[PDB]
Structures are given as C-alpha cells and as structure tokens.
Amino acid sequence: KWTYFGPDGENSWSKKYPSCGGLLQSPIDLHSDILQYDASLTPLEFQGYNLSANKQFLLTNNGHSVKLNLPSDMHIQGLQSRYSATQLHLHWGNPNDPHGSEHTVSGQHFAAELHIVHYNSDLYPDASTASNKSEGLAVLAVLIEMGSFNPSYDKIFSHLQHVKYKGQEAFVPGFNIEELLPERTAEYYRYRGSLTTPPCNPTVLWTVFRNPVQISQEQLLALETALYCTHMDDPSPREMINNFRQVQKFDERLVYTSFSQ
Amino acid sequence: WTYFGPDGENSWSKKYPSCGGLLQSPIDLHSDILQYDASLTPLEFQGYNLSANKQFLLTNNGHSVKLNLPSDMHIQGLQSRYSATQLHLHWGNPNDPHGSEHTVSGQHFAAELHIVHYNSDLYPDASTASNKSEGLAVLAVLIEMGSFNPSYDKIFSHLQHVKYKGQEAFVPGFNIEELLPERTAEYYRYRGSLTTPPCNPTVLWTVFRNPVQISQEQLLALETALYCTHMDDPSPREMINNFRQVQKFDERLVYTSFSQ
Ligand SMILES: COc1c(F)c(S(N)(=O)=O)c(F)c(NC2CCCCCCC2)c1S(=O)(=O)CCCO
Ligand SMILES: COc1c(F)c(S(N)(=O)=O)c(F)c(NC2CCCCCCC2)c1S(=O)(=O)CCCO
Ligand SMILES: [Zn+2]
Numbered sequence A: 001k002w003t004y005f006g007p008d009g010e011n012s013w014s015k016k017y018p019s020c021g022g023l024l025q026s027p028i029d030l031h032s033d034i035l036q037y038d039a040s041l042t043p044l045e046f047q048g049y050n051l052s053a054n055k056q057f058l059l060t061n062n063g064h065s066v067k068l069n070l071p072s073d074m075h076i077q078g079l080q081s082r083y084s085a086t087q088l089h090l091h092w093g094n095p096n097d098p099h100g101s102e103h104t105v106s107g108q109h110f111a112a113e114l115h116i117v118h119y120n121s122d123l124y125p126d127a128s129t130a131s132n133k134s135e136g137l138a139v140l141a142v143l144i145e146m147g148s149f150n151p152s153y154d155k156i157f158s159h160l161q162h163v164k165y166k167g168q169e170a171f172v173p174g175f176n177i178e179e180l181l182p183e184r185t186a187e188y189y190r191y192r193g194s195l196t197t198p199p200c201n202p203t204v205l206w207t208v209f210r211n212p213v214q215i216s217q218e219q220l221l222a223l224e225t226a227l228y229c230t231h232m233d234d235p236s237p238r239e240m241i242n243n244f245r246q247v248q249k250f251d252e253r254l255v256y257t258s259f260s261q
Numbered sequence B: 001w002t003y004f005g006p007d008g009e010n011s012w013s014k015k016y017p018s019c020g021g022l023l024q025s026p027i028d029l030h031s032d033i034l035q036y037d038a039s040l041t042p043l044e045f046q047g048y049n050l051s052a053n054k055q056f057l058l059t060n061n062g063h064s065v066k067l068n069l070p071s072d073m074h075i076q077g078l079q080s081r082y083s084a085t086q087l088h089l090h091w092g093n094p095n096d097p098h099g100s101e102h103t104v105s106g107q108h109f110a111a112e113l114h115i116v117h118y119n120s121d122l123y124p125d126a127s128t129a130s131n132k133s134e135g136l137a138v139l140a141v142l143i144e145m146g147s148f149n150p151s152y153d154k155i156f157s158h159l160q161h162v163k164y165k166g167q168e169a170f171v172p173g174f175n176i177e178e179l180l181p182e183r184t185a186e187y188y189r190y191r192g193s194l195t196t197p198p199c200n201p202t203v204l205w206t207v208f209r210n211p212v213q214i215s216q217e218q219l220l221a222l223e224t225a226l227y228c229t230h231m232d233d234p235s236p237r238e239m240i241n242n243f244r245q246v247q248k249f250d251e252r253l254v255y256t257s258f259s260q
C-alpha cells in the first residue's frame, strides 16, 4: 500500500521497509562537488536490445509505474559480469507540473525518467534472487526532457489506454530498445545506490546517461493522465502521478563520470 | 534522531508521525510556484537589540548550535505577536558546502539561519505553542560565501566553547537584526512545518529573498567546530550536513512580498 503521497508516502516507507531508511539510497542530485572523472568507465555494450517486431512483450500497470518485461537474452556488457535485462519502467510528474525525474542534475528535475533494470545473470537465476545481493542489479537511467515527439517512446505510450488500472496487462510488439537511449551513451554517471522504491535494497549499480532524450508535451500528458494506481473497480481511485522519490543524502558517496568535461 | 545512518530523516516518522504528515518543510522555492501577494507587508523586528549587559545561552544540543533568545524580542506585523525563543543554523560540510534547508530554483545556499518565534498572544511558551494552530513563526536567512561578517562572528567566536553535545557558553547581547539581510521587506512566505522532529505542521515560514555573506573561514569554522556527540563519547561524530532534504510541495503556492 506504499504510495508517493499521504500517510503511506515516502517519508513513511521505512516504517515497513527498513532499507528505505538505510544507507546508499537513490536517487541523488548530480552536482559538481560530488562528481569525479574515472577513466576506467569504458563504454557499455547493449546486446540483444533490438527486439523482434514479430514478437511481443508484456506491458503491466503494477500500481506504482508502467513496466515492460524484457527477455533475458538482452544484456549489457562491459560490466565485470554480464547483466541481463528484466524490465523497464518510468517515473513522471503531473499535467500541471511535468517535472518528475528521480535523479536531478545541478538541482533541476527533468520531465520524466526511464529505467532499464538488469540483474547479474552470471551469478543469479532471476532478478528477484539478485535483488538482495551486492551489485545484484544494474539500472540504466535516461533523463527525459519535454521536447520533440519521440516515435520510439511512443511504441510504449501508444498502449497506455490499455493498462489504465493496476494489474492490467497488454502486449507491445518488439522494437529496438536502444532507440530509447540518448546520444553519446559512452558519457554517463556511475554510482552505488539502491532501488528507488520499497524495499529500497542497496544493491543497484546505477548508470545515468549524461544526455537526456526528448518526448513531447502531448506524450507527457498521455503518460500523466492515462494511468491509475488502483484497480478498475476501486471506489477510491488514485491517479498515477508524481511517482518519483525525492533525492537522498549522499552518505559520503561520490559519483563517477566517464566524461571529464 | 540524526541526519544519517539508521536514525536519519527517512526514519523520523517512526517515532515522530508528523514527519510523515502534511505541510512538511523545507521546500524548493522556484518560479512556477511563486505568487506575489500585496498583503505581505514588512515585518518589524522589535527588541532585537539585546542588551550588551545581559547574556544569552548558547548550546550544542547535538543537532545544531542554538542561542536562547528572550521573550521581549518579537516580530510585529503578523496578526498575533510572535515572541522569540531561539536561533540556530543548518550547514553542509567542507567537501560539499551547500547545506541550506530551503533551496531557490533547485540550488542550495551554503547555510541557513533560523530565528524561531512562538505565538505569545495565544500561548504561554514555545513548547506549548509548538503543536497548536498558528503556533510558530520562523525567519530564515540564506547564507552564502563572501566577505567576512562581523555580526555573525558575534556567534561564531563562541563555537569552540560549545564543541560537544551538552556544552554551553554565554553570549553577551548584540543586535540580532544585524544577522538579517538587505531589504527584509522582500521575502517568501508559506505555511509549513518544523524541519526537525517532531515536524509539527505549525510554522509560518518567512524566508528572506536576499542572502547574507560570511567568509570562507567563517563557513569552514561553522562546518568543522562542532560534534554531535558528548565529549566522552568514544566514537565522536562531526556535526555536518544537519539539514533536511526538500519535501514534495504539490498544488500550492509560495507567496512573495515582491513581484519584480
Ligand atoms: C517502479 O518500481 C520499480 C522501481 F522503481 C525500480 S528502480 N527505480 O529501478 O529502483 C525497480 F528496480 C523495480 N524493479 C526491480 C526488478 C528486479 C528485482 C526484483 C525486485 C524489484 C526491483 C521496480 S518494480 O516496478 O518492479 C516495483 C518494485 C516494488 O518493490
Ligand atoms: C535544530 O533543531 C531545531 C530546528 F531545526 C527547528 S526549525 N528548523 O526552525 O524547524 C526548530 F524550530 C527547533 N526548535 C523549536 C523550538 C520551539 C518549539 C519547541 C519544539 C522544537 C522546535 C530546533 S531545536 O534546536 O530546538 C531541536 C528540536 C528537536 O525537537
Ligand atoms: Zn525506477
């Protein structure tokens, strides 16, 4: 029953989910004082991201976000283990305040954020097993700005009126997930953190790409208005808006960058 | 309660339920939520010129450094008189010297001064006022780096004597209005909360628009002089990063006394 607003909102998550009050929490504000270049942060390789358009992938409203399941033959390499994709999802604001990224850059929110969740498939047989192990998860984050219409993101957003309510599922034809990534993916921020939702496990290696992508105001409005956190038959409906966590204290961490300027 | 580890701000709501309730402070003061309000006339700071012949208690309470203030000191210009009770500060650390509580357009200032007052027309003391309607009013001064500030030094020159939790020192009276910035007529105003436990949503906030300056050495002194542990603690903890993260603030406004 955790939420982003009211008595079950984020200042209360730790009452039920102790790690949400623990160390290494995400998201964070990316600002100069805590950035340090690291020349070892070489480019990731995106393997099997080009999903067949003749296949289909499950889109689910889970009550907290909209997620797309991804196949385990999709991987990132370049890490010291190979990590396999498990799902992607988004975080966003609301129609009257389209400023719902989780990470901030120099104190500013972007309109939204995409997360592509992977797990260490060298070591673990599924993401649920990996999720409570050190470096078990690797999440890629793409900052999203209001801008031009994005046909690639629309391959997801065009299905939103079919997963309006919690528990609903739809199919999305495959497409090349690398189309959701920004330019110059070799340029990224890297840090050790956590899930940004309960149970807040501090088991995530985060990669936030330096450059944002754009989606239109109309795409953001669809994202911000189509979805509910509640079931179709709930007599107390709740709009799925503002589903981002506030940024967290650093706890002495630095953020490492693959770019020096 | 603390500002880190297991007893840090995400856990305050366990013992202090209002920390997970409504109207929480601090917040980001940013353009899209500001609205000019002509009713926001200047405050008057009365009895702020504290007698040099009196002394005022400075404490390290393990969370900040606080200076007790006398109840004859008050704000005029609100519907009720709000009498002073104490002032204190919030700051970051030398590696990231940006520890204000409020932010402006997403940016932290170096530090922030709060002068806490209570509604003495309605309530007999600050403790009684603290959980009641219209109970508290806090003035906030944003602090940045710049030239040396002799007035802030009237406080900071005492910090070494309150290095550890529980320690105290006496500060001779001075003019507290010297701690306020230029053009105090220009301010942000909103209804919010204490930024520490118990987080009561009973604070009328006034954040002055313009910051003050202190020197690099003054800011470093503030950031390095104090511990949040008692002197005999075999595991000392520096008092740094003693600010709360900004809170969500949806479907409201911060009112401004200025439009331009
Ligand atoms: C939108 O919610 C998120 C979420 F925000 C994040 S984030 N931002 O990447 O940390 C997630 F990683 C996940 N998924 C992970 C899947 C792999 C491991 C299994 C445990 C859940 C984590 C999810 S979730 O949709 O699955 C809901 C999890 C509720 O506990
Ligand atoms: C540094 O801690 C603060 C503090 F941050 C704030 S803030 N930022 O102005 O909301 C405070 F107001 C207070 N003092 C108030 C005094 C008047 C009412 C009695 C209850 C305590 C609030 C204090 S305190 O040093 O006294 C510690 C209180 C722990 O409960
Ligand atoms: Zn996420």
Ligand SMILES: [Zn+2]
Binding pocket: B088, B089, B090, B114, B195
């Ligand atoms: Zn304060």
